Amino acid sequence: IGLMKAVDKFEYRRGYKFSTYATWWIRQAITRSIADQARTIRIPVHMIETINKLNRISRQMLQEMGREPTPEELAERMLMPEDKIRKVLKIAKEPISMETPIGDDEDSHLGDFIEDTTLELPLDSATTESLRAATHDVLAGLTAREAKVLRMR
Amino acid sequence: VPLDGGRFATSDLNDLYRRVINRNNRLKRLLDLAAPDIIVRNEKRMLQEAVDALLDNGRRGRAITGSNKRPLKSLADMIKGKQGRFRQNLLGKRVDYSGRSVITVGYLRLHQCGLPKKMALELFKPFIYGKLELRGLATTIKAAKKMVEREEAVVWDILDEVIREHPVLLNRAPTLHRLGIQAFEPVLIEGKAIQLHPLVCAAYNADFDGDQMAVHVPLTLEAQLEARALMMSTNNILSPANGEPIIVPS
Amino acid sequence: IETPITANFREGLNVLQYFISTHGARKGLADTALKTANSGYLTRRLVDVAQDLVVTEDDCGTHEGIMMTPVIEGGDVKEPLRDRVLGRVTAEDVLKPGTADILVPRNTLLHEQWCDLLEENSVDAVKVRSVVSCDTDFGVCAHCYGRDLARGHIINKGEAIGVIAAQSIGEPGTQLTMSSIQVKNKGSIKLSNVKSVVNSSGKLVITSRNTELKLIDEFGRTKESYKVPYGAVLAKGDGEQVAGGETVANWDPHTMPVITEVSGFVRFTDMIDGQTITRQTDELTGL
Amino acid sequence: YSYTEKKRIRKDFGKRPQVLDVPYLLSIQLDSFQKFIEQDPEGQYGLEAAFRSVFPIQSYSGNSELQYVSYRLGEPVFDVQECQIRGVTYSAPLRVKLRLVIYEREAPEGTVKDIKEQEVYMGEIPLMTDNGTFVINGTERVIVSQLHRSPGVFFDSDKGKTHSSGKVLYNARIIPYRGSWLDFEFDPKDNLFVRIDRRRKLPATIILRALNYTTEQILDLFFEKVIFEIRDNKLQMELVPERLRGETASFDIEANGKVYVEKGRRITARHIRQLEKDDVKLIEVPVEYIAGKVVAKDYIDESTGELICAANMELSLDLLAKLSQSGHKRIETLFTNDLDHGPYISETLRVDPTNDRLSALVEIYRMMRPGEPPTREAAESLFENLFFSEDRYDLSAVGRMKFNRSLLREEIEGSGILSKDDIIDVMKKLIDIRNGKGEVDDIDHLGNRRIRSVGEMAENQFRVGLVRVERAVKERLSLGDLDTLMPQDMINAKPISAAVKEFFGSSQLSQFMVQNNPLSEITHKRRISALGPGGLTRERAGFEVRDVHPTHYGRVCPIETPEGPNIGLINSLSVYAQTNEYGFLETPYRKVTDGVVTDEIHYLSAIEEGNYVIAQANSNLDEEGHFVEDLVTCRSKGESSLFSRDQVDYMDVSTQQVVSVGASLIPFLEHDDANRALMGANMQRQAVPTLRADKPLVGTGMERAVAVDSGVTAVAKRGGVVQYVDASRIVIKVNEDEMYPGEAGIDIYNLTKYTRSNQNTCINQMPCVSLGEPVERGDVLADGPSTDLGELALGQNMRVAFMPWNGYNFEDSILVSERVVQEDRFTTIHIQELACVSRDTKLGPEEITADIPNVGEAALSKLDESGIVYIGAEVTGGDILVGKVTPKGETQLTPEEKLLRAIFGEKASDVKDSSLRVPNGVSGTVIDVQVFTRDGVEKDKRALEIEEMQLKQAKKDLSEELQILEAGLFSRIRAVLVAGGVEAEKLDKLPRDRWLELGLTDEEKQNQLEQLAEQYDELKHEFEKKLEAKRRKITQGDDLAPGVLKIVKVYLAVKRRIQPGDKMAGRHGNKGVISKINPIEDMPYDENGTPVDIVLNPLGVPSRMNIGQILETHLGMAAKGIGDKINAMLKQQQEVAKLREFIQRAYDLGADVRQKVDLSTFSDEEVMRLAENLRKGMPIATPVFDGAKEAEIKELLKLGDLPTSGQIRLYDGRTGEQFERPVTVGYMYMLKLNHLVDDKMHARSTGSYSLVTQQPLGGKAQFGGQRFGEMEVWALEAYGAAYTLQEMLTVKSDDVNGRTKMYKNIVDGNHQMEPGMPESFNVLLKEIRSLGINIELEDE
């Protein structure tokens, strides 16, 4: 798709060979697809450019120091403060899988251990229909117009 | 879903639906630019590979692996095989109101078993809440949750009235024949091991060298009568394979 | 191995006597671990075949099925009639060797008391209602199945007998991976489906494949059964009463003879040397 | 005798002498990693061999190259204990010096243009500790050795692959270390085939034409020529007489004047004998002997120039004289026999579709890369890159020595690349096996299988990472700049470090070390697994690779393996087995020359063993003459027989060399069945260490070598005298002759206190020397967890009766007494770890506080002001350890709960309880708290109290380094000024610091005094340069996970006693569970009143056939009657001379027992310390196949005044009646296994459910329900129980709206189920509908 754009923009009066100009468009269309696609949770191209900037500079800190750079000391080479460097390091994860075999034999996957932390507990379900019946008894013992506004308010 | 430490954990189908969509939106971009018919042929041949790998992964060519070099689990792999829906979640299931422990020998009668008290309090837990509310010993259900967890003196006198005449199923795996799961009336013991009768050990093929057995509580009123009239330990003294007795002293 | 382990576990083995014993103690231990998978797959296959077989009737009203008989072949009795027939249902009106004594209204449950009534007389062949011959569409009836073995009466309706069948065949599956004919007892000689010819000496010889030796005692049942080939030599005849301890039949275990029924002369005809036959003589004898 | 042995000498019952002592047991782990890590010039090993196999590398164009110089390992930034605490890998950095040489493509060889030479850091390799483990992410791991197939050539066959014939098909096979495979094979038409990498088969001549061999050269390499001559009228051939061996005469053969064999007759061996004695080589042969022959050359006519017959063509009669009409009196054909010289090559050339070289190279391209059209230069480079390139093929000279020694060559060294002399010599040797000479191999032979340990598998994984350098360097020297690029710029560190990091932690052979014993650690390191990458599979292994081959003798134990699906694939190294330089296992043997058994020891491998003939270790020896029998039982050629006295070449070194280390610890092994010895050796590695260690009374002699070599004790490096013993520190003053002349000579040992193991057990070292006693080199100073004075003590030994007691020991149950529980014999300590981590949350940071909402003030009575439990608190289940809260969102009130808040007034704030509580069922005691904190985050008041307590210890534990250093060096300071003059009242009574200003002399004693001043300048500056390095290792912030603010780790310490249900076992494969804990007065007692501790069933002994436990019981009672006669003579205070008589009498009782211990040498102080250790019983060493006989046991029972039958009269404890028959009573050594009933018991009513399927979870850690599988459904259908089955499929498991109704119906008292459709069924309906298949329910 980038090559078909380079054919449209090419001029033969400039006096350069075609492979000098078309290489810029193919390298633009390929790297834009790795930044848009190739990720589950899509990161915009300005943050991918900052994440890749951290991975070329942390290799330079592995050259000189011989150790992994601390985010307190990695923040000097980037001209960025400690909060944004530590926040760019929050996005470092990829989704793992649910079918990854965390047992050494082929019986258990990671999806068999993840709990549905959504619905309700049957003690919390039975303590509500007990509370709905206590209010129907207490309000029935009050005067009917105090008990009417107490159900409406 | 998000995991604990700021990560996420996804299905393998989301990766298989993304390359169906990405290779389908890109085909609509080649039919607008009037691409030459080698680029459009390769894109239709790439959409065929993406739709086939979603329905059945390792069938038409090489299987599309993820980033782990193991292949992506497709839609047919969720139905087919030993770890599919038909054999792991429909014909067998994980089951509530159940536990397991190490078995040891019993003084018991033929229709009895020894169930530990720390084990029988957790299995019969909503049966106690229905009698701590009925006897006026707790004014609400969340006050009976406090008394049971405290193990007060009235809890062990209501557990002894719940368990009376309430049979329970004892299961030893592998269940090679039908006598591998029978019903017993519990006798509460203060320990951590289930006490079995010595004459039912031939049917379970059970010896006390470290074996374990599972307990299952019958809940409704028709499951408590099948456990007494069909699966009780005195009902089964003959064998169903041949007519010979199965309670021979060993 | 050529030498035995001449030591026991009280005197203690040797080093070479112990290294030999771990050849066959791991050969049997890797057998027990690798055959419970082969039997758990056979039991899963047997459940599927017999899945939906449920007793859904009481009496399908069909005619006869399997004829029962002892398993006396080869040697002694292994299943008598009291082991194969106890619990079944009689298919037709069966009677005694002393004829015209019907015991049944054409179908009864043949329990232990009727088994002793068959023990008394010389009857050793009954026809029972089998399950393959049941005429019910989508299930069997309780009469073609017979006695429920785990209880001891006639089976009820709605009892899943196909799951009981699969779990009873697959349960021992993890356990069991590992000339001359002499008469032994005083009994008669009877040959059935017979074809024979009085031989050159004064005895009988057999000239058919479908004939087998039957041993009848003084009552009327068969106790022993032997197979005898085509062209064998019998030392006695038929219709006789000869006691045991006699090698009554004999043949060559190499030779399969072509013995002839007809008494007559034999000439050479339609066998020309170099075309169908050859000339080979025994130079030691000449004959 | 060493000092560790003189306290308690174990009585030996062995008869044979021991010529070779047991080697260092962990030698396959330490000696294999040292090759990977040390520097070697030319005998290439490890990292240096891999750096030369990648570097140097020149560029794509050819103008630059990198050059390797050397490498060096920096020191690790933490020790071993600082890595187990933070949870980081103990590793050292690798720094490699490289050089970049750049050429110029204008000059021809302008070599010196650019040279940059510097040091580059590429990854960190994990170091092996002192005992052979690896600290990977704070956990000790062991990398297991792998028994794989050795490279080289290998010939085999199949029996019954083609069933319609029943023939045998032979196959040849070349296996490299790295590269493609290459199989040759036969088929039922006797043609030769070739498949590369198990692809489709091609005819085998299609690779010979690819090697540029014409049909004239293919026919010459495999066939011999039958030459024909014509003497102008008739045909004559030069005949070899040994050609017609058993072949029918086609014509009537003759001689020069005599007739030999008539037509249709076998040419007998007499006629083979006849023809050399007339010596006739030319025979007149007719024309009908030629019709059917095959021409061997290309035959033309030189007059016109057209061919008469091509090579490999069937000659006829009209072609015969046409060759003679062409001017040929010399015709050569092919010798072809049906029996011994088969035409397998020539019948394969008919099926070959190719004819030349370039047509043959295409036919390999259409198999290797199918679908892609081939060219000339693409097909040429593919065949070269398969086997003939250094970079993509390696035979790896282990595989070149075995390639040459299978083709009967002479060379050992060579090259890792096939040649035309290697390929054709494989096809020739396979043809000989088809002809009849030679035979096929077996894979299961131990000369064909090879062991590959840690230093080799880490070296194969370092070449994999270095290939990623060869991509990025060759893609930088063409692209990147030239006059600026340094080697640190181009070299990455991430792919090379992540190939090694993915091996130590993710491999199938890098697994958690079993750490509940000293024996479990020592047998997990000496493990030989056939699994892993490049090995077998538990499913895809047959019966043949799981068996005991006879080459296993002395190399792999036959009774040390699991009994599940891993039965033949996980093996264990023997006691004396070693490794070759190539990896093949070897075994010591004593040389036997001329009858005299020499004491020089040779290590023979598996191939070399089968040549000789080797005697047994049980053979009697007539005092260095020869053996006592004429027919000594031996084993030659792989099978046992009887041989003469001068026919014997070697002898076995020991009687234990066949068994492993764990299987050599069982006494009376030869009386046990081999089924129960496999089970007893497996349970011995699961014994939990107890509260007090108890030696075994009946041992085997090999307990002292397991405990010292496991490294779990603290042996002495140098000899000397103990100076100060604590419960945590041993300070030994070194002897003067062992002191090197620079240092103060004080060795200081710090013992590891109560520490968690891998299996959550206790590690605790206790000192076993007292104040002021001499210690030799190798003596034991501190016992480990399960050692006792340096002897391995896995369990306790208690009084066992063999009788049935009222059904409480029915079928493998064990009846234990109350006195065993009161004495805390099997009480074990378990340590646990509970982590509470507070992370960044987008709603706000979580905080560790004590102010917890909606909880009492008694729940806060254990926490401090910061919210962490006190060190020393005694917690119970449910109690709060670390108080933590998270900020909430906004809660959605119900209509009724909106009124309850609006009546009483309690508002719910932005605080939600998620504090770490004690897991239920555990009642422990907090012994440690560790707090980690991210850098910049403010520490709480307890995180400042912990790091202040660590800092005072790093000032105090560093003070005693320097203070006891100058304990012997303060005398050096003063007395040198007192040397050479007396100032005995002018120096001492003054203050101590003013001692350098004394009476002054000439120039000599001030040159000494500056050394006394340089002593102070050295000693002052040496304490500060290391003090700040620890002060910045304590107050430093930590390398925590992303988002994690602080972690609190709380260590509990539980104390578990025995219980009905706890599994106990012995050494002879007799396991069991405790069924009852009986009181003392109910146990059976003898006539003296001493009750029995454990009652065991006697019906488990005969059917299982382990008679070790009957003989171990009778010897334990014989060894207790000696400790009871010593304990009598010690309480009665007789004399030290009468105790000298009895202990000497009990030490020489056998016939020809090997040891001689003499108490005339021992002093009365040494005797009374030995007799104090022998008052509990005399320990006795019964070796493996050299044990004590029943006459020697019954003589030891007479010495203690006990019945020789071993059976005493027992009385009933409850009725007082005497038992009718006497009962076997003795002392069996019982273990407590790691299968406790506290860990097994589980129950659940309602809990958490799964996400997709909405069924309950699985496991005790998830509070999960039991699995009601397929087999338990079929049993509910065979019963007829239909309502029991419906409730387990819907309301127990998966029906969401119907399982919350069943819960309320039970609280209401209405046992009624209202079921619905399960949630797993309509998850299935959405999946088949997502496959384009319309599945629906056809409703009413």
UniProtKB/Swiss-Prot annotation, chain A:
Signal peptide: none
Region (Sigma-70 factor domain-3): 49-125
Family per similarity comment: Belongs to the sigma-70 factor family. RpoD/SigA subfamily.
Site for Interaction with anti-sigma factors, residues: 153
Source organism superkingdom: Bacteria
Taxonomic placement: Bacteria, Pseudomonadati, Pseudomonadota, Gammaproteobacteria, Enterobacterales
Record comment regarding domains: Contains 4 domains, connected by flexible linkers. In the active conformation, the domains are in an extended conformation, each making extensive interactions with the RNA polymerase catalytic core. In the autoinhibited state, sigma-70 factor domain-1 packs closely together with sigma-70 factor domains-2 and -4, contrary to the extended conformation that is seen when the protein is part of the RNA polymerase holoenzyme.
Subunit relationships: Interacts transiently with the RNA polymerase catalytic core formed by RpoA, RpoB, RpoC and RpoZ (2 alpha, 1 beta, 1 beta' and 1 omega subunit) to form the RNA polymerase holoenzyme that can initiate transcription. Identified in a complex containing RpoD, the RNA polymerase subunits RpoA, RpoB and RpoZ, CRP and DNA. Interacts with Rsd; this prevents interaction with the RNA polymerase catalytic core and with promoter DNA, and as a consequence, promotes transcription from promoters that require alternative sigma factors.
Subcellular location as annotated: Cytoplasm
Function: Sigma factors are initiation factors that promote the attachment of RNA polymerase to specific initiation sites and are then released. This sigma factor is the primary sigma factor during exponential growth. Preferentially transcribes genes associated with fast growth, such as ribosomal operons, other protein-synthesis related genes, rRNA- and tRNA-encoding genes and prfB.
Name of the protein in its database record: RNA polymerase sigma factor RpoD
From Swiss-Prot, chain B:
Record note on biotechnological use: Co-administration of salinamide and rifampicin or salinamide and myxopyronin suppresses the emergence of resistance to both antibiotics.
Paired cysteines (S-S): none
Binding site for Mg(2+): 207, 209, 211
Post-translational modification: Acetylated on several lysine residues in the presence of glucose.
Superkingdom of source: Bacteria
Function description: DNA-dependent RNA polymerase (RNAP) catalyzes the transcription of DNA into RNA using the four ribonucleoside triphosphates as substrates. Resistance to the antibiotics salinamide A, salinamide B, rifampicin, streptolydigin, CBR703, myxopyronin, and lipiarmycin can result from mutations in this protein.
Assembly and binders: The RNAP catalytic core consists of 2 alpha, 1 beta, 1 beta' and 1 omega subunit. When a sigma factor is associated with the core the holoenzyme is formed, which can initiate transcription. The rRNA transcription and antitermination complex (rrnTAC) consists of RNAP, NusA, NusB, NusE (rpsJ), NusG, SubB, ribosomal protein S4, DNA and precursor rRNA; S4 is more flexible than other subunits.
Family: Belongs to the RNA polymerase beta' chain family.
Protein name: DNA-directed RNA polymerase subunit beta'
Swiss-Prot record, chain D:
Annotated effect of mutating residue 678 to M: Resistant to antibiotics salinamide A and B
PTM (free text): Acetylated on several lysine residues in the presence of glucose.
Keywords: Acetylation, Antibiotic resistance, DNA-directed RNA polymerase, Nucleotidyltransferase, Transcription, Transferase
Result of changing residue 559 to S: Resistant to antibiotics salinamide A and B
Effect of residue 663 to E: Resistant to antibiotics salinamide A and B
Superkingdom, taxonomy of origin: Bacteria
UniProt key word Aminoacyl-tRNA synthetase: no
GO CC entries: cytoplasm; cytosol; cytosolic DNA-directed RNA polymerase complex; membrane; transcription elongation factor complex
Gene Ontology MF terms: DNA binding; DNA-directed RNA polymerase activity; ribonucleoside binding
Similarity field: Belongs to the RNA polymerase beta chain family.
NCBIfam families for this protein: PRK00405.1, rpoB
Protein name as it appears in the record: DNA-directed RNA polymerase subunit beta
